[PDB]
Amino acid sequence: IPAFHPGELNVYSAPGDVADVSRALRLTGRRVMLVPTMGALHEGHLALVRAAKRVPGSVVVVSIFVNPMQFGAGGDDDLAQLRAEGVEIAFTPTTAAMYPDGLRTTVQPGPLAAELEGGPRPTHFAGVLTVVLKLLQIVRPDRVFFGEKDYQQLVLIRQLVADFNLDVAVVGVPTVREADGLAMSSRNRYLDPAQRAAAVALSAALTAAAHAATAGAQAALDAARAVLDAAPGVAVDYLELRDIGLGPMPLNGSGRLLVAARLGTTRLLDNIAIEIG
Amino acid sequence: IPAFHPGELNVYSAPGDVADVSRALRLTGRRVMLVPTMGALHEGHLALVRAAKRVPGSVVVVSIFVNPMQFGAGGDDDLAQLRAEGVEIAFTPTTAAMYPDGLRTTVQPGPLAAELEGGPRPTHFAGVLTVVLKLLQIVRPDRVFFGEKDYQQLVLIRQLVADFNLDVAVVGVPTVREADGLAMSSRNRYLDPAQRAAAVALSAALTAAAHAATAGAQAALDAARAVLDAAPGVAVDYLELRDIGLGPMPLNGSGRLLVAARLGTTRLLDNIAIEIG
Ligand SMILES: Nc1ncnc2c1ncn2[C@@H]1O[C@H](COP(=O)(O)O)[C@@H](O)[C@H]1O
Numbered sequence A, B: 001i002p003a004f005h006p007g008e009l010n011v012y013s014a015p016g017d018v019a020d021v022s023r024a025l026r027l028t029g030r031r032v033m034l035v036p037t038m039g040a041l042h043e044g045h046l047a048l049v050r051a052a053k054r055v056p057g058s059v060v061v062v063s064i065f066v067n068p069m070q071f072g073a074g075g076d077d078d079l080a081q082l083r084a085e086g087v088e089i090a091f092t093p094t095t096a097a098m099y100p101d102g103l104r105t106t107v108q109p110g111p112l113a114a115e116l117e118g119g120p121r122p123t124h125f126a127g128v129l130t131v132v133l134k135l136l137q138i139v140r141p142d143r144v145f146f147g148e149k150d151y152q153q154l155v156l157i158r159q160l161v162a163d164f165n166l167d168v169a170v171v172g173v174p175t176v177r178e179a180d181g182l183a184m185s186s187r188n189r190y191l192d193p194a195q196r197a198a199a200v201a202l203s204a205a206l207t208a209a210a211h212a213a214t215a216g217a218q219a220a221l222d223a224a225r226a227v228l229d230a231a232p233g234v235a236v237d238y239l240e241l242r243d244i245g246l247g248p249m250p251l252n253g254s255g256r257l258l259v260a261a262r263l264g265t266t267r268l269l270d271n272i273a274i275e276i277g
């Protein structure tokens, strides 16, 4: 078994090393928490880590991995940040370690993967679910944390876990926002100051919608569309109101409003809870 | 937690019930063994059960489930037999319990699934791997047992376990045969006495090949083909020599010879280890 130093950051890149350390720790009664990321960490990621850390005695495992793009699809102080959060395990595998036999067996999501973010990127969620399934098997966490920021991803992870009978609790963590409401994202770094200012329209549109919703679903959608239309440098890709599981919105109930929009070349996403009437 | 009576047969049909009992038993140090079947049990299945039982203190879980056919694909004393073998858990889920949300997330095998048995049934191994992945997650066995009888299936399960980082040992169990060499199978029950007699040709052809192989790969294939051609009521679907992982056979080394053949309407399979020269 590789060395593990409790109460310090321990970095592993081989799946077998994390699997052995995780198994040994879980046997002592320390619950293991998994927080999957693509690195370039910010306060949105740190909220997931802090939620994992709230679990007494937990070993928090944060993975950093950028899954390769499949055919036809286009597209640092991380460890220091994790250490300062009291994360004990960082898992940083190479592509070759994750895929030693290439892309062979994979996960095929259900049809929700072709909707919304799957429209522009029809293979994206197959990659996500394949990687998350692997991380779950390597780490064997008690709980795994995903942000509401990627709501469709979170819903699909719930489907993965239900459909494959996975014995992990999926924990969704609320979106972390800047003071003006802009959802935090590493992509925000691509925005120039004017685009950053204009980008507040996404959260402004969704929050306006969530309040407009006392007057019903159409009022909510129309309020959001009006705010986005008022922002000249924001080009909307989609703005959709769905039920909480991303099926069709019901006449009366809880739903989710999702937007994707481009500021110049940068595509941003946001979503919010909606209660109808 | 559902009742569990040690040293007796316990039957569960709900995934959650087996998952809770398995988790509780594993915590006591009893290792859990999983033997997946489609019921209609015979001595070939019992060999898998006996191999599982050899593991001291093991709880043997035998699942009985017939996975539904996907679109475009065509096609009792089981519990008493398991009880007499000292099996403590039989898991007998309905289709609805296995697929409460229908066929949604599934496993997509690698390209070996389209070869050999996947030729006639291109969706068959996706169903197999999906079901086995679910059974593995429900039961969380230390080891899972598959017969060499279904060699391509066994190879694909090894791929599933490697590619998804599954923390289970896959145990292949040698094929159980009748006294004359016919590989045991529930399908043998479909054969009339004359067809049963003729069916010995499959094992005769493979065993002849395994001995002919001192003279090389072509000699081995030709010996097998000659035996099959000598049996007038046996129609060969395929006869292929491959490496042990079912890639192309190497010039010198270990391989596997696989045959599929029809006697009237009944399709039978057999395979054997081959050592080249
Ligand atoms: N602003 C945010 N608030 C909450 N979660 C976030 C935020 N940004 C990213 N995440 C979550 O962090 C995880 C890793 O994101 P990524 O590194 O973008 O794969 C995913 O579960 C995201 O949904």
Ligand SMILES: Nc1ncnc2c1ncn2[C@@H]1O[C@H](COP(=O)(O)O)[C@@H](O)[C@H]1O
Pocket (backbone or CB within 6 Å): B036, B037, B038, B039, B043, B044, B045, B047, B048, B145, B146, B147, B148, B149, B150, B173, B174, B175, B176, B177, B183, B184, B185
């Ligand atoms: N004659 C046999 N010898 C060894 N294993 C067998 C035999 N017949 C069936 N099996 C194994 O029993 C398991 C269940 O088979 P089935 O019930 O046909 O799905 C599979 O792993 C088969 O490969």
